[PDB]
């Protein structure tokens, strides 16, 4: 079957066609998985169907961990590499659209951050700056 390599942008569990998790393992960022090119919808959410050993299997990865999610900033936001370290001097402005990858991360400061940027760089934005 036709397969395409997709980079995992956020630690992703495997799910079956019933939105229930498959196994205890998880594919870690930023590794690559082979999936079907066209996407599918489970419970309204977008998924990729995993291809293993040349055949499609009952394993699905949430597309938010591959394609991400286009979000709009409601505040001006800095780009962070950790809780206290700034990643650069980029200042994202209110109204700009940014793609975030996967569920938010809780840093050690207690606040929650979104991984941004289609790359492997430690670039995070506070969730409180979105919606």
Numbering used by the authors: 314 to 444
Sentences from the paper on this structure:
S-layer proteins (SLPs) are self-assembling, crystalline proteins coating the cell surfaces of many prokaryotes. The Lactobacillus S-layers are anchored to the cell wall through interaction with teichoic acids (TA), either lipoteichoic acid (LTA) or wall teichoic acid (WTA).
The amino acid sequence of the C-terminal SlpA_III domain is sequentially conserved among Lactobacillus. It consists of two adjacent repeats of the “SlpA-motif,” the “Surface layer protein A motif/domain” (InterPro: IPR024968). The crystal structures of the TAB domains (SlpA_ac_III, SlpA_amy_III, and SlpX_ac_III) reveal high structural similarities. Mapping of the surface charges indicates a large, highly positively charged region within the interface of the two motifs that extends to the C-terminal part of the protein. The four residues observed in the vicinity of phosphates are conserved with the proposed binding motif of YxY….KxxN. SlpA_III, the teichoic acid binding domain, is not involved in the self-assembly and protrudes inward to the bacterial cell.
